Amino acid sequence: DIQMTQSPSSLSASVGDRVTITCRSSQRIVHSNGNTYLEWYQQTPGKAPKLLIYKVSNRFSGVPSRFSGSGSGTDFTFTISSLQPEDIATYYCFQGSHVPFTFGQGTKLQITRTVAAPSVFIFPPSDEQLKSGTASVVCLLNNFYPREAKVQWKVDNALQSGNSQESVTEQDSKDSTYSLSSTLTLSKADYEKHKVYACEVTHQGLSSPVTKSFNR
Amino acid sequence: DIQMTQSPSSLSASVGDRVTITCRSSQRIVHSNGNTYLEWYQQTPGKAPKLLIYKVSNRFSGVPSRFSGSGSGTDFTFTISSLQPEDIATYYCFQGSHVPFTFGQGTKLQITRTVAAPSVFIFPPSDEQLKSGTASVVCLLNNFYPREAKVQWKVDNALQSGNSQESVTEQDSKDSTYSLSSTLTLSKADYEKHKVYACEVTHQGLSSPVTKSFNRGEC
Amino acid sequence: EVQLVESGGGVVQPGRSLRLSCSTSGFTFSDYYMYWVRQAPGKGLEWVAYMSNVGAITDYPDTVKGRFTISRDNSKNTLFLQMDSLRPEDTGVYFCARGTRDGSWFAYWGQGTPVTVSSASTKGPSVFPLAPSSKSTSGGTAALGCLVKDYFPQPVTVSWNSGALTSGVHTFPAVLQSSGLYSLSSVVTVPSSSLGTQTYICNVNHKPSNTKVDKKVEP
Amino acid sequence: EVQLVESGGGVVQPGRSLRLSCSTSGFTFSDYYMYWVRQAPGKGLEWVAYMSNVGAITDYPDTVKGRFTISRDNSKNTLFLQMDSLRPEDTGVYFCARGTRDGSWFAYWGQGTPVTVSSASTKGPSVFPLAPSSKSTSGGTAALGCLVKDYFPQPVTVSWNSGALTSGVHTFPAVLQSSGLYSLSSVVTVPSSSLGTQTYICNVNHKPSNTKVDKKVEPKSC
Ligand SMILES: CC(=O)N[C@@H]1[C@@H](O[C@@H]2O[C@@H](C)[C@@H](O)[C@@H](O)[C@@H]2O)[C@H](O[C@@H]2O[C@H](CO)[C@H](O)[C@H](O)[C@H]2O[C@@H]2O[C@@H](C)[C@@H](O)[C@@H](O)[C@@H]2O)[C@@H](CO)O[C@@H]1O
Ligand SMILES: [Zn+2]
Ligand SMILES: [Zn+2]
Ligand SMILES: [Zn+2]
Ligand SMILES: [Zn+2]
């Protein structure tokens, strides 16, 4: 049961900076044949992981030379020479020297960029959805940074709670920003019970909380 | 009046290699304000170009520092310190100083990798097409390198000529290989006048030409 | 061209069985030890099994040892994984993987086939238009989208204009609802002054239930 | 986020006019000089026009002076390109661009809009399947595709399974036939043991002839 521990669990750096991730095994990981099969993998949402480094320092064919690996004993490190927006992904180390083979917990890698205010759009329930008997109001926060953001719903000035859910996209591989969606769900009868709907967005790039709304 | 000549038309290089693309201006291209608005662009097929270098050496934001630009007078250069598979594209210089503004003719940058033999597939014509009065036979060469490949059509052993067209994909952005298609086109009449259709593939990754074939009817 | 494609994943009740398949191509299957690796929703990677090229040498981690069985048909380049006595905890995406002769474990992977162990039944999604309006417009920008509501299990794929539209596109990760069904929203921003100039269609795909919807979003 | 979107491109006969629009968002339109750049098929780029944010200052390369007229509406974030007396040569993709405050020319581009000036008549394509068979199989790899034949003019967009299928896909560059029409093929490889493990449908769009066709491809032959 050789455990693999990476550090840190997540880290952010500027496009161009050098970054390093460490992986430590609870016991030496040298195969009986002498090789040390410590590998490094990179994965992004919905995709299969990609092998980067194997046998400690071997770069798999097709992997950029700005990635490298090193180490021995119980401590190993993965390094990216000049971080880029497309390296936004999760990185795990793997050990195949001792069965059962084990993966590290993974390390998330983000990009540090300048703050960027979010654009805010609100979407009332569609007509064809109401005939379904339910009503979903959607609030959208587009291309902002940092990720922290507060989204509050207000029905006739009453702040909502427990009836909305938000989802956040992965840090964009281009402008290194985030987008988010907050969805307020109500039944058709309840929804038809009020007039004004609105989401209040508070983010660092905004001089003060921004609000978007409609009433029908 | 001010012509911009890029060199070379195309160049291939191994992963991690250094790369230099040059662009020569007919006259001195330094704007009346002092600057030299010489720019460098990168473009992949069916897509809009992307700006990498402006003002001769300023790197556009989000552009990897491995790309650089320099020069003056009439000789400017675009540099890639460590070529990578994703860089396969066409690069163009641009002169914005003295009007009228012009682009270089461009440079195709390919990658050099290990020889990969192609897989060969052949497709008989579809019945729908036959009703049309014409028949198209497609020979497909999948993921191979180098690009050079001789695809030959033989009908009942009669070597064909001048009745087929080839099309090659862009060098793949990941495995650095190419794929190709050769289409033999005949009328139904002439197509139904023969039995065996075959395309013989000659490539550097093949010891002897690989031939894929079928018989109008069944194997 | 090394390719791996898994299949067989579906919704299965706790205690019951499921058998996954892995079809390969592009290499001498018989020469390679094959592997299965899984990833539970929102979790890390986990090695599930391995099998020698020949000799039937197999092994697994204690979590599936006794319930799972890996096997292979070298005559059809196919790796299998029999999963018996499935538990909710076995839910996740299952990947097929192959290493290299010189030492790496997972060099090439399949797209992965989804497995959901639950007493719940599959459920296609309802797709509702998030129409661009004066309320969906902001800093010169207009927003539009599609709400993919109430489906089960994961996952759902989304494209715009058959994959032709990708600029300004944001497909959020799914969210489990108290009802126990997932909901997903996909959006795109476009300059408002262009509204009425282009067609927007979200191609939604929920394979687990073989449900496909191509909703047109109109202002 | 900065966005640019062109529209209005189309197929037109020599002598007609066409009006292109570029709608923008994500920046202060009235603050920048705007550009129009085009690309003839298989050719390089060519600057076509520019206009001052304010002041109506314009200019064009000699090839279009007198026929093309750039203009804007700083109130609708829209840039226009009036194209009068088109010529076969004006055939190509027209892009909208915007530079940067510190000396950049084309820092942000639109996706592009296709324009074709021809006296030849528009023609939609036929879509025949390239059925996977044992002749389409090789080293455990099966191959299948679709053939997009005899159409005019460019371009044709092709996708598989409405976008859900992209791995192993190869959509070849169009090739002009002696007939005067274009033709291209889109194919995809898969392990043989698959096939049936999913359905395969090509989606063929050819806007000039109002063609949007989906064609399911299934096994046959030997
Ligand atoms: C192409 C192939 O399948 N080769 C196998 C070899 O597997 C390869 O090498 C190992 C180290 C690993 O990177 C595999 O992913 C790769 O395909 C086999 O090696 C065994 O592999 C299993 C699976 O992980 C175990 O790791 C086992 O310990 C390995 O054996 C050790 O390494 C070998 C290279 C020999 O030194 C052996 O004596 C060691 O015990 C071998 C079977 O050993 O068979 C092909 O070579
Ligand atoms: Zn209420
Ligand atoms: Zn291929
Ligand atoms: Zn003949
Ligand atoms: Zn966005």
Closest ligand to Cα C34: 1
Inter-CA distances, B37 with A192, B34, D48, D104, Å: 60, 10, 18, 8
The experimental method, as deposited, was: X-ray
Q: Coil, strand, or helix at residue C26?
A: coil
Give the integer Cα–Cα distance in Å for A138 and D156: 36
Q: Which residue's C-alpha comes closest to atom 30 of ligand 1?
A: A33
Cβ contacts of residue B32 below 8 Å, gap of 6+? none
Q: What are the backbone dihedrals phi and psi of residue B53, each rounded to the nearest 5 degrees, phi first?
A: -130, 130
Closest atom of ligand 1 to A54 CA is 13
Q: Which of A95, A113, A131 is the last residue of a domain?
A: A113
Q: What is the token pair recorded at B82? A: 């460590």
CB < 8 Å from B in window 28-87 of D: 44-47, 59, 61-62
Give the integer Cα–Cα distance in Å for B93 and B55: 11
Pick from C33, C48, C105 the residue to mutate for probing ligand 1's pocket: most ligand atoms within 8 Å of its CB: C33
Phi-psi region of D107 (alpha: psi -120 to 50; beta: other; left: phi over 0): alpha
Q: What are the backbone dihedrals phi and psi of residue C165, each rounded to the nearest 5 degrees, phi first?
A: -105, 115
Q: Which residue of B has its CA nearest to D154?
A: B46
- Closest to A202 in 3D by CA, of A148, A136, A163: A148
Q: Which of B113, B145, B165 is the last residue of a domain?
A: B113
Task: Say which residue the tokens 């719903």 belong to.
Answer: A153
Q: What is the token pair recorded at C219? A: 């202002």
Give the integer Cα–Cα distance in Å for B24 and B32: 19
Q: Which residue of C has its CA nearest to B119?
A: C1
Q: What is the token pair recorded at A102? A: 């084990």
CB < 8 Å from A in window 1-30 of D: 1
Going by DSSP bridges, is the β-strand pair C11-12/C113-117 parallel, antiparallel, or unpaired?
parallel
Q: Coil, strand, or helix at residue C30?
A: helix
Phi-psi region of C66 (alpha: psi -120 to 50; beta: other; left: phi over 0): left
Helix (H) or strand (E) holding A130: helix A127-130
Ligand 4 centroid from CA B179, angstroms = 28
D5 residue type, one letter: V
Closest in D103, D131, D187 to B126, CB measured: D131
| Counted domains in chain A | 2
3-state secondary structure C43-54: CCEEEEEEECCC
Going by DSSP bridges, is the β-strand pair D113-117/D11-12 parallel, antiparallel, or unpaired?
parallel
Q: Are A142 and A183 in contact (CB under 8 A)?
A: no
- Closest to D49 in 3D by CA, of D79, D28, D29: D79
Q: Which residue of A has its CA nearest to D1?
A: A143
Task: Say which residue the tokens 């750049």 belong to.
Answer: D37
Q: What is the DSSP letter of A195?
A: S
Q: What is the DSSP letter of A127?
A: H
CB < 8 Å from D in window 155-184 of A: 175, 177
Q: What are the backbone dihedrals phi and psi of residue D199, each rounded to the nearest 5 degrees, phi first?
A: -100, 160
Closest atom of ligand 1 to C103 CA is 13
Q: Which residue of C has its CA nearest to A117?
A: C139
Q: Coil, strand, or helix at residue A56?
A: coil
- Closest to B181 in 3D by CA, of B143, B207, B127: B143
Ligand 5 centroid from CA B68, angstroms = 29
Q: Are C151 and C201 in contact (CB under 8 A)?
A: no
Kindly report the nearest CA distance between residue A102 and chain C, in angstroms.
Answer: 7
Which residues of chain B are within 8 Å of residue D130 when distances are taken between CB atoms?
Answer: 123, 126, 138
Upper half-sphere CA count for residue A182 (Cβ side, 13 Å) = 22
**B142–chain D Cβ distance below 8 A for any pair:** yes
Kindly report the nearest CA distance between residue C182 and chain A, in angstroms.
Answer: 11
Helix (H) or strand (E) holding A190: helix A188-191
Residues A160 and A136 in one domain: yes
Cβ contacts of residue B100 below 8 Å, gap of 6+? B2, D47, D59, D61, D62
Residues A136 and A95 in one domain: no
Which residues of chain C are within 8 Å of residue A55 when distances are taken between CB atoms?
Answer: 102-104
Closest ligand to Cα B160: 4
Residues A135 and A184 in one domain: yes
State the sign of the Cα–Cα–Cα–Cα dihedral B97, B100, B101, B102: negative
Give the integer Cα–Cα distance in Å for B14 and D65: 44
Give the integer Cα–Cα distance in Å for C160 and C153: 22
The Cβ of residue A117 has, within 10 Å, a number of other Cβ atoms equal to: 18
Closest atom of ligand 1 to C101 CA is 1
Closest ligand to Cα A196: 2
Q: Are C160 and A153 in contact (CB under 8 A)?
A: no
Q: What is the largest CA-CA distance in chain B?
A: 75
Residues A103 and A142 in one domain: no
Inter-CA distances, D41 with A141, B46, D82, D90, Å: 39, 10, 21, 10
Give the integer Cα–Cα distance in Å for D11 and D114: 8
This structure's resolution (Å) is 2.5
Which residues of chain A are within 8 Å of residue D1 when distances are taken between CB atoms?
Answer: 119, 142-143, 175, 177
Give the integer Cα–Cα distance in Å for C22 and C78: 5
Inter-CA distances, D9 with D22, D46, D91, Å: 11, 17, 10
The Cβ of residue A105 has, within 10 Å, a number of other Cβ atoms equal to: 17
**C105–chain A Cβ distance below 8 A for any pair:** yes
Q: Are B134 and B186 in contact (CB under 8 A)?
A: yes
Q: Are B183 and B141 in contact (CB under 8 A)?
A: no
Closest atom of ligand 1 to C105 CA is 15
DSSP string, chain B: ---EEEE-SEEEEETT--EEEEEEESS----TTS---EEEEEE-TTS--EEEEETTTEEPTT--TTEEEEEETTEEEEEESS--GGG-EEEEEEE-SSSSPEE---EEEEEE---BPPEEEEEPPPHHHHHHTEEEEEEEEEEEBSS--EEEEEETTEE--SSEEEEEPPPPTTT--EEEEEEEEEEHHHHTT-SEEEEEEE-TT-SS-EEEEEESS--
Q: What is the token pair recorded at D36? A: 């129009």
3-state secondary structure C120-185: CCCECCEEEEECCCCCCECCCEEEEEEEEEEEECCCCEEEECCCCECCCEEECCCEECCCCCEEEE
Q: What is the token pair recorded at C29? A: 């299957």
Residues B203 and B100 in one domain: no
Q: Are A37 and A29 in contact (CB under 8 A)?
A: yes
Ligand 1 centroid from CA A31, angstroms = 10
Cβ contacts of residue D125 below 8 Å, gap of 6+? D148, D149, D150, D151, D156, D183, D204, D206, D209, D211
Residues A73 and A17 in one domain: yes
Task: Say which residue the tokens 């894929």 belong to.
Answer: B212
Q: What is the token pair recorded at D62? A: 């000699």
Task: Say which residue the tokens 């790039």 belong to.
Answer: A205
D78 residue type, one letter: T
Residues B86 and B120 in one domain: no
Q: Are C4 and C96 in contact (CB under 8 A)?
A: yes
Q: What is the token pair recorded at A156? A: 């006739």
Buried-exposed string B64-86: b where 16+ CB fall within 10 A, e elsewhere: bebbbbebeeeebbbbbebbbbe
Q: Which chains touch C (3 or more CB pairs under 8 A)?
A: A, B, D
Inter-CA distances, D196 with A19, B163, C7, Å: 45, 35, 11
Contact C189 D77 (CB under 8 A): no
Q: Are D103 and B60 in contact (CB under 8 A)?
A: no
Q: Are D35 and D50 in contact (CB under 8 A)?
A: yes
- Closest to B181 in 3D by CA, of B101, B109, B108, B123: B123
Which residues of chain B are within 8 Å of residue C1 when distances are taken between CB atoms?
Answer: 119, 142-143, 175, 177
- Return the CATH number at B60: 2.60.40.10
Give the integer Cα–Cα distance in Å for C115 and C84: 13
Residues B77 and B121 in one domain: no
Helix (H) or strand (E) holding A154: strand A150-155
Task: Say which residue the tokens 């198209």 belong to.
Answer: B136
Residues A91 and A166 in one domain: no
Residues A140 and A68 in one domain: no
Phi-psi region of A9 (alpha: psi -120 to 50; beta: other; left: phi over 0): alpha
Q: What is the DSSP letter of A170?
A: P
Give the integer Cα–Cα distance in Å for D117 and D208: 12
**In DSSP terms, which residues pair with B89 in a beta bridge?**
B109
Domain containing residue B41: 1-113
Task: Say which residue the tokens 């097709």 belong to.
Answer: A62
- Closest to C48 in 3D by CA, of C22, C23, C28: C22
**In DSSP terms, which residues pair with A14 in a beta bridge?**
A112
Give the integer Cα–Cα distance in Å for B92 and B114: 28
Closest in B62, B65, B85 to A82, CB measured: B65
Q: Which residue of B has its CA nearest to D110?
A: B48
Which residues of chain A are within 8 Å of residue B51 when distances are taken between CB atoms?
Answer: none
**Pocket lined around ligand 1, Cβ cut-off 6 Å:** A 33, 96; C 31-33, 50, 53, 99, 101, 103-105
Inter-CA distances, D147 with B140, D169, D208, Å: 12, 14, 18
Going by DSSP bridges, is the β-strand pair A210-214/C92-98 parallel, antiparallel, or unpaired?
unpaired
Closest in B102, B126, B169 to D172, CB measured: B169
Give the integer Cα–Cα distance in Å for A147 and A150: 10
3-state helix, strand, coil in chain D (%, to 5): 5, 50, 45
Cβ contacts of residue D70 below 8 Å, gap of 6+? D34, D36, D49, D50, D51, D58, D60, D79, D80, D81, D82
Contact D194 C23 (CB under 8 A): yes
- Closest to C183 in 3D by CA, of C207, C153, C160: C153
Residues B143 and B180 in one domain: yes
Residues B134 and B213 in one domain: yes
- Closest to B49 in 3D by CA, of D1, D4, D9: D4
Q: Which of B87, B113, B139 is the last residue of a domain?
A: B113
Give the integer Cα–Cα distance in Å for C217 and C188: 11
Q: How far is the first Cα of chain C from the last one, in angstroms, to the nearest whole number?
A: 44
Q: Are C122 and C11 in contact (CB under 8 A)?
A: yes
Does residue B8 have a cis bond before it (omega within 30 degrees)?
Answer: yes
Radius of gyration over every alpha carbon of chain C, rounded to an integer in angstroms? 21
Ligand 1 centroid from CA C99, angstroms = 9
CA angle, corner D125, sides to D123 and D128, nearest 5? Answer: 160
Cβ contacts of residue A178 below 8 Å, gap of 6+? A141, A143, A144, A145, A146, A147, A149, A168, A169, A171, A172
Please report the domains of chain C, with CATH numbers, ordered by start residue. Answer: 1-119 (2.60.40.10), 120-219 (2.60.40.10)
**B202–chain C Cβ distance below 8 A for any pair:** no
Upper half-sphere CA count for residue B119 (Cβ side, 13 Å) = 23
Helix (H) or strand (E) holding A210: strand A210-214
Ligand 3 centroid from CA B179, angstroms = 6
State the sign of the Cα–Cα–Cα–Cα dihedral B7, B8, B9, B12: negative
Q: Which chains touch A (3 or more CB pairs under 8 A)?
A: B, C, D
Cβ contacts of residue C75 below 8 Å, gap of 6+? none
Give the integer Cα–Cα distance in Å for C101 and C97: 14
The Cβ of residue C151 has, within 10 Å, a number of other Cβ atoms equal to: 24
Give the integer Cα–Cα distance in Å for A182 and C31: 51
Which residues of chain B are within 8 Å of residue D145 when distances are taken between CB atoms?
Answer: 123, 138, 140
Q: Are A80 and A74 in contact (CB under 8 A)?
A: no
Q: Which residue's C-alpha comes closest to atom 31 of ligand 1?
A: A33
